[PDB]
Structures are given as structure tokens and as C-alpha cells.
Symmetry: C3
Subunit: 289 residues, 3 copies
């Protein structure tokens, strides 16, 4: 069986003083198409394969291509994936919950380098022999994630640096806890990163959370992000503040709102301020199909 799903998004993206001779405000848009092939068996084992075709405004050649394939095998809550995998640091819950605006971005996200699912081709040739293995296991409320990425699997393993990651999250109706740790993140020797987060659903309407990160060799040093969101009917209000250890850094912060226009249609906007005083703002729509 083959299924297709995806989303389109478009709107305005403002970056205060983007560059000499550059427009501060542009129309930023993205089209994402996922192609999923699945083979269900009567033994209860599912085999799947996925390809992504994603286009972003500004992409080279004004064209769209597919990325590198991902394969998986699923059985009784256990999923083993091979190829262009989702990694543990990128898959755990809570780590991206300060996201806001129609481009779902946040200075409050971890400021470190690590591997993640590659949505597109890479013209440098760097990902040509990149291969990962990932294992996920889900119990009721517990999620365990394991990932191993070899950036160049054809070369002897002792000559290249592999990324190894582990992560777990747990949640009940009101409290959520999550943690992750990855050694040699991004294939960088000694870039060891970690995350610990917690969130409290202090109503059926609000949430407040706190994420803490060790960003390894990144110049940001350790980081803390405090975020919260509140739903008023169809409109959701979001905010966050984040601090890094880098000497002289500013406190980053953002404020935004989402409006659920219809099932699958979300109008979003945000005003954010970065660690180096960058001012960014956006307003747009995302529609899922």
C-alpha cells in the first residue's frame, strides 16, 4: 500500500536588518510531501519505507527532489528503523514545545549540533554513505529511544566518529518528564549533549514547562528554557524565555498565538528576540493534507 500526506505553509517572515541591500520582510513558504510504502503481514509485523519531497522558498534551482530513504520494521510496540532515521535527541517529547509562529521556531530550542532526520538531499556529498539504525519502544506512557548514526558507513568504523543517542519520556494526564543524552553528537568528537525537561498541565487549558540542556562543545554552554501556553477556545497563546551561559548573551524570549481555523488549518504568528538581540517576527498559515 502507498500513502501520501503532507502540508503546505505560507506567510510573512520578518528579520530586523537582515542585510545590506536585502528586504527585511519576505514571503516564506514550504511544501512537504511524504510518500509512505507499507506492507502489513498476518503475523503482526509491519514493514515500511518512506521518502520525503520538500521544497522551501530560496531552494537552489527552484526545484524539488526526494531525500534518502528510511526503512522500518514494527512489531508489538517495537520499531527498528534503518537508513535516514529519526534520532533520539530529536524524537523525545517536550524538547521542542517552546516552538511558536507558523514556522514553528524558537530560540529556546537546544543550541547544539546533532544529527536529525534529513528532509532533503545534500549537494556537498557529505551524506552519501550516511546510515543510521534506530530502535523505539513504547509502553503505556513510557517511550524509549535509541539511535546510532554512522556518517560514512563504507569506511572502517575506527576512522570515523559515530553518534550514539539515548532518550526516554514519560507522561500521565498532568506531568511529563523527558531526558536525553547523545555522545559525539553530529559526528563531533567529545560533543556530548544532554537534555532534561518537565512540563505540568495546570488545567485542561494551560501548560508550563522547563527544559534544561548541556550543549556540549557549542559556544552557548548550558541552557534553560521556560515556556508556557494557554488555550482560549480556538486560540492558543504561547510564550518562552531562554538563557544560555555564553558571556554577554541576552535573554531570548518570544510571544505568539495560534488560531485553529478548522481541522488541519492553523493560523500562527510570533515575535521573538534572540541571544544576540536579533528581532524576528512571522505570521502565516499551515494546512495539512
Amino acid at each position: 500500500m502507498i500513502s501520501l500526506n503532507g502540508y503546505g505553509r505560507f506567510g510573512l517572515q520578518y528579520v530586523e536588518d537582515r542585510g545590506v541591500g536585502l528586504e527585511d520582510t519576505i514571503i516564506s513558504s514550504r511544501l512537504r510531501i511524504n510518500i509512505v510504502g507499507t506492507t502489513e503481514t498476518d503475523q503482526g509485523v509491519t514493514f515500511g519505507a518512506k521518502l520525503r519531497m520538500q521544497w522551501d522558498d530560496g531552494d537552489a534551482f527552484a526545484g524539488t527532489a526526494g531525500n534518502a530513504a528510511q526503512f522500518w520494521t514494527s512489531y508489538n510496540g517495537v520499531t527498528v528503523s534503518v537508513g535516514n532515521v529519526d534520532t533520539a535527541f530529536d524524537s523525545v517529547a517536550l524538547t521542542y514545545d517552546s516552538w511558536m509562529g507558523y514556522e514553528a521556531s524558537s530560540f529556546g530550542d537546544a543550541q547544539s549540533s546533532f544529527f536529525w532526520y534529513n528532509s532533503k538531499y545534500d549537494a556537498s556529498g557529505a551524506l552519501d554513505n550516511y546510515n543510521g539504525i534506530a530502535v523505539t519502544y513504547s509502553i503505556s506512557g513510557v517511550n524509549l529511544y535509541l539511535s546510532y548514526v554512522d556518517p560514512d558507513q563504507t569506511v572502517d568504523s575506527s576512522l570515523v566518529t559515530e553518534e550514539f543517542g539515548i532518550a526516554a519520556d514519560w507522561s500521565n494526564d498532568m506531568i511529563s518528564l523527558a531526558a536525553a543524552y547523545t555522545t559525539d553528537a553530529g559526528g563531533i568528537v567529545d560533543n556530548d549533549i544532554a537534555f532534561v525537561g518537565a512540563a505540568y498541565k495546570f488545567n485542561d487549558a494551560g501548560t508550563v514547562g522547563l527544559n534544561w540542556y548541556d550543549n556540549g562543545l557549542s559556544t552557548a554552554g548550558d541552557q534553560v528554557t521556560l515556556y508556557g501556553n494557554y488555550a482560549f477556545g480556538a486560540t492558543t497563546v504561547r510564550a518562552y524565555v531562554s538563557d544560555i551561559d555564553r558571556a554577554g548573551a541576552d535573554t531570548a524570549y518570544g510571544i505568539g498565538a495560534d488560531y485553529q481555523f478548522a481541522e488541519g488549518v492553523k493560523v500562527s504568528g510570533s515575535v521573538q528576540s534572540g541571544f544576540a538581540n536579533e528581532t524576528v517576527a512571522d505570521v502565516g498559515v499551515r494546512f495539512d493534507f
Copy 2:
């Protein structure tokens, strides 16, 4: 929801004396696949996104890629589109009705340069930050079209030339009228083009029309195309004659036929003569799927 549609076409394409060491007759073919994502809402607003994958014989690398995305929002007869848009000069009725043969071509088409929907990627890098906005409005019989194309939206607007186009068509059962005007067509300063056309359905079987163009900075100068077509059951006969103001130009003319083999299957052929005495002929099939 995601839908796929398209067409295939193949046949013979003859160009008298194509070139030294070249075959005059070749097998010319095209595969076109459109990927359309749509999100319908109960408020009556539809969101859509589209991608095209088109291959033509002779294409570089013997491969097919997707183009740059188009997004739209529709409500009550009004459609706003963003990204790789259809422009007003290319969308108006009548302007392409002298087309003939299985490759749907005609020397009688406007001899000017202007932007249009980009079916493919562009290896030059020229379309990388190209972005358009288009608005269409349809009443019963009236169609209004507006388009604005910025060839490089990241650069300050006063440093680049934007194309602005406007067009409208109207029709009842027998008479059709259409007009268009575009300033700085194709991003060329002072390339201002215009079109005015009219067609008369002098039966339920025949049509005769006349298109007039101002081709802006093109060397062709003003142009007039007179065309007609007549249906005899499943077979349609077509002809046209066209004249440009260029000094020394020949009258262009063409004669062709279509045969509707089945719903979605059209066999077509044409013999055409250009403004510089070029002789072209074709015969092939188009099938829609």
C-alpha cells in the same frame, strides 16, 4: 487529501533542415505529473498546494525533478495564489486558441517575453528567489486576473524589476472577448505588452477568432493572428495565419487536425510555416490520466 493527475504525449516532430549533422525528424514526447494537496474547510475556504514533475525528450541528465511550489486559498469565486503562480497574460482566454498539432504549438501565439508558471527547475539559479502573488475572480462569464511577480524577492524591491499584469475575459454562448496588459513583462524594464482578442462561434461546430498583440520590446513589433476551427463529428480541423510588423517577415500559417479517439485520448497533427520561413510538422497522441 492528495490527488495525482497528468498526461503523456508522444509522436513525430519534423523541423525542415534542423541543423548540420542533425536528424530532421525525431520522436518527441512529454510526461507530466501534477501533485495536488487540498484542505477543504467547513467555512467554505479551500487551501491547496501543487507540485509538477515534468519530463521532456532531450532533458538534461535523463531525469525528472519537481518544480517550485504553488499555494492557493479559495473562497467564494476568489482565488489568491502565492509562489510559482499562473500570470494574467498566460491565463486569459483566447490567447492560445490557434494552437494545433499534438505539441499544441502555434507561430500565431504572442511573440513577446513574459513570466508564466514554471513547469520545471532552472539550473541557472535564476528562479531561486522568484515569487509571485496572483488573484483571480470569476463571476458568471466574467473572469478577472491579476498578477505580480518579483523575480528575486530577497533583494530590496527598488533594485529589481517586478512584472505587473492584469487581464479579463468575458463570454456568452457565441461571442468571447479578452484583453490583457502587463508592464515590465519578464522583468524587462519598459517591455509593456498587451493583447486584445475576440472569437465568434458561428455554429455549434465552428469558431473564427482574431487576436491582436503589442509585443513590447520584442523585434516582432505588433501582431495579428486570425484563426478558425471546425468540428466534423470526432474530427476537428484547425487553421491560422499570423503577421508581425518585423521588416521582411513572412506570413506565418498553419493547418492541422485533431481526432478524438476516446475520452482523454487525442490524436493530432499539424503542418506550420513560421515568420522566417521555418517549416515544422508533427503527428502524435496525447492521453490524459
Copy 3:
């Protein structure tokens, strides 16, 4: 109508002493997606078009693109195809029946150069004006195949070498016979190749066959491959031995097994030895969707 089908495969691929500084064992995988457009008519003539998107581990840019299109017209057992066609030497029965392992490979396959369906783009530019015509005709048990490939159809025909191929196979319940002949195979002047094969189904469980080849200008010279396979319920055991005329060559041989885990899911493995003493082994899964 547009349909999508394909397969995914992944597993281990071992090549004894692959290279200095290289890993002998790698994770080898392939994703194949076929896009088929078809137009059925009430006259009984079907028109079709096909595109393929295939990714293999190690592919340049860690991306996937479509190949060059194939078009066909079918009526009463006769199929005419144009464009990126399947050729007669590659389409006949029996010639690939010594295949084994999850990568379906065999040293026992013909050691010659010839054109075949191109699954992917070609960055060299070599296939840009490549065009084929192929005609197949199937009676009850008889299959006839004809193919003509022009590697650069834009250039005068007397300046380029075209491949012409013919093939036929016949089978009843127990005996199968097949033969093929191709002149200027692969666009190489005087590379004339041939094949003759026969297979005997000596049960409802086993098969033994013998393929013979004339490999034209290849250094392998003539070749003989003897293969057999036996089904034990869901598990199939396969073997082959092959000899070439090249001076000093070793006898190639392979042994493998398939396990039909479920409809559309096949687990396969093989250990093979080549004509130059190469030792290859594989183990993996293929799943069809």
C-alpha cells in the same frame, strides 16, 4: 488513472576484502517507487506512461529523482513502447533465473554489455537523447520481443550505432525454452550477443536449467550457467555454477535460500564466489507495497 507501487529492501552486504580502509560488511538498501499513468479506452486500446524514483545506499547527493519516461500503447496482446524501454535481451524469460540473495544477483548472469531499462538519471549526460522503440507480442505460452535503441536520436542515424534486439520464449507446464540475439549491444559496433536457455520443472517443487551465452566483445567469451532451485514449503533453496572462456577464470558458484515470510515479504541470503575469486555474501528482506 494513476497508480503507485514499489518495494523496499534492506540487509547486510559482505564483500571479502572490499578495499584498503573500507568496511567489508555494509548495510545495503534500496527504495523503488513506480508511478504509472493509464488511460483505458472502450475500443480496447490502453495508453500508459511510467516514471521510476529509485534510491540506493551510496547514491550521490543523498537524494532521489525520477528517471526518463516510458510510454506504451497496448491492444490485443501487442504492446508498443517508446522512450526508456525494456529491451529484448533483458526481457526474455530464464536469463535471470540463477539470481539469489536479497539483492537478486548472480555471477551466472550474462557477462556482456547491452542496453536495459534505465532506472535512474545519468549525470554524465550520456542518456539525454537516448530513445528506444520496443514491441512485444504474447500468444498463449509464446512471448516475442523486439527492441531498437538509438543512443542519441537527434544526430543523423548513420553517425551513431543503434542496438537491435530480438528474443522469444516459450513454456508449457514443465519445459521452458528461451533465446535472444542482439546486434551492436550497448551501442558498441560488432558487440553481437546471444542467449539460449532451457529449464525443466522436475516436480512442482524443483527446477533445473541451463543458460548459454555468447558475450560478444566482452573478455569473458562464451559462458554456461547451470542452476537449480527447490521449494520446501515456504523455504526455497537455490544454487548455480557458471563457467566463462576467459583464460585462467575460476568457476563461479553460489548457494542461497529464500523464506516467504508472508505475501509480499521475502527474507533472502546467499554466499557467492566469482570468476576472479571474489567472495560475496548477503542477508536481508524485500517487502513489496
